[PDB]
Amino acid sequence: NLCTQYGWPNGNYPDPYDCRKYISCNGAVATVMSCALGTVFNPNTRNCDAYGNVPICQYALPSPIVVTNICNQYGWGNGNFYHPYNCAEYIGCANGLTTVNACGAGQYYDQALGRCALAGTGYCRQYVFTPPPAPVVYPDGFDTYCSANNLATGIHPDPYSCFSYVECTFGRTTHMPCPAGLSFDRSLLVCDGNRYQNCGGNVLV
Numbered sequence: 001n002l003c004t005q006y007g008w009p010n011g012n013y014p015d016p017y018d019c020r021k022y023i024s025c026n027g028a029v030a031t032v033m034s035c036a037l038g039t040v041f042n043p044n045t046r047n048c049d050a051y052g053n054v055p056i057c058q059y060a061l062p063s064p065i066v067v068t069n070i071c072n073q074y075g076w077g078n079g080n081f082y083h084p085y086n087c088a089e090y091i092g093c094a095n096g097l098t099t100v101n102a103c104g105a106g107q108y109y110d111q112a113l114g115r116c117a118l119a120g121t122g123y124c125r126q127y128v129f130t131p132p133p134a135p136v137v138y139p140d141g142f143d144t145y146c147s148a149n150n151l152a153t154g155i156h157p158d159p160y161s162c163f164s165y166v167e168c169t170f171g172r173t174t175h176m177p178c179p180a181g182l183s184f185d186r187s188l189l190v191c192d193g194n195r196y197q198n199c200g201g202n203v204l205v
């Protein structure tokens with residue numbers, strides 16, 4: 001089964017062919033499951049979700065995965081990114097223009113490396129991560145986070161969500177989500193595709 005082939009923890013994973021379904025890794029065995037009508041698999045929550053929250057899933061089209069405009073639909077910067085549904089594909093973003101790429105046979109996209117690579121022992125790691133709470137609740141007073149902690153003007157990690165960042169601006173505090181599918185890289189202080197590193201997938205494996 002795919003779960004043990006990739007060295008995946010138990011949990012939910014995208015179906016690469018139908019974004020109305022998903023792969024449930026239970027007891028170390030893969031089961032293809034269907035989302036309820038009106039919901040599709042949300043790659044960022046690892047759960048079925050109201051289809052309006054997942055625009056890259058066009059559940060009315062015969063082939064519903066439509067990442068064809070994702071750099072512009074989600075505002076991803078330039079570079080290579082994991083494919084949200086398919087471990088053997090990836091995305092090239094240039095100036096808002098999307099390129100959907102595929103690795104050679106027997107090869108899988110390694111997001112950390114930024115390239116396709118042969119199957120090893122524990123891969124497709126970009127699908128292994130812990131989503132933030134749904135919704136993310138900020139404590140009363142978080143509007144003073146930047147001031148109270150004397151944070152410098154600029155970008156900071158959001159300590160409540162790995163999908164988000166804090167912006168400190170004249171001692172004012174804002175938090176903002178990364179582009180959907182991107183997560184906050186606390187070492188580079190940018191939103192990028194390293195969900196595995198950014199959202200605690202390392203501890204799951």
Ligand SMILES: O=C(OC[C@@H]1O[C@@H](OC(=O)c2cc(O)c(O)c(O)c2)[C@@H](OC(=O)c2cc(O)c(O)c(O)c2)[C@@H](OC(=O)c2cc(O)c(O)c(O)c2)[C@@H]1OC(=O)c1cc(O)c(O)c(O)c1)c1cc(O)c(O)c(O)c1
Pocket residue numbers: 050051052053054055073074075076135136175176177178179180
């Ligand atoms: O970009 C898209 O999806 C992203 C998301 O888009 C919104 O959700 C929808 O647009 C949406 C639309 C629907 O029709 C629907 O049925 C639904 O359930 C949600 C926001 O989600 C909301 O539902 C929402 C929630 C609220 O509590 C609001 O007060 C609100 O006005 C909208 C927003 O998410 C947020 O803005 C957001 C902000 C937070 O502070 C936060 O904690 C959070 O969880 C979400 C998020 O955007 C970002 O997170 C975001 C932020 C950036 O700074 C950035 O650079 C970027 O590229 C993307 C998108 C684009 C399209 O063309 C679509 O047709 C579509 O359906 C979706």
